[PDB]
Amino acid sequence: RKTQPYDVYDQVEFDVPIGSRGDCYDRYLCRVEEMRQSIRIISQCLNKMPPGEI
Amino acid sequence: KQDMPPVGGYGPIDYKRNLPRRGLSGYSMFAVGIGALLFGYWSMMKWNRERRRLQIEDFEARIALMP
Structure with a gap:
């Protein structure tokens, strides 16, 4: 997502959670701290939508 | 011109x-x-020390009669 752009993805800020040790319970803990990043973007992306065609 | x-x-x-x-x-x-566990035992040591006081009283009647 941030090493390559998609479709304007570049203009919003987020942090990519990371784990400690390679077991499962640190692949779970991404998927909580990765649901608490999204609500940042949906909250950041309701303010910017410019009028225009589709 | 109605948008979100x-x-x-x-x-x-x-x-x-x-x-x-x-x-x-x-x-x-x-x-x-x-602190609770103790007040448990202190509540024993008395009931159980009273119930024996009746125990002897019960074996008394038995020995009283039975000649």
Whole structure:
């Protein structure tokens, strides 16, 4: 997502959670701290939508 | 010319994490706890020390008669 752009993805800020040790319970803990990043973007992306065609 | 975004103003509501509340922590327990267990035994040592006082009374009638 941030090493390559998609479709304007570049203009919003987020942090990519990371784990400690390679077991499962640190692949779970991404998927909580990765649901608490999204609500940042949906909250950041309701303010910017410019009028225009589709 | 009817489109979505309002004029100005919003939240946000945060994403943050807190839900830590206690709750008698840190040796406050082990303090009340061992305090109840004792008042348990002190409530014994008396009932059980009274019930024996009746026990002898019961074996008394038996020996009273039975000649």
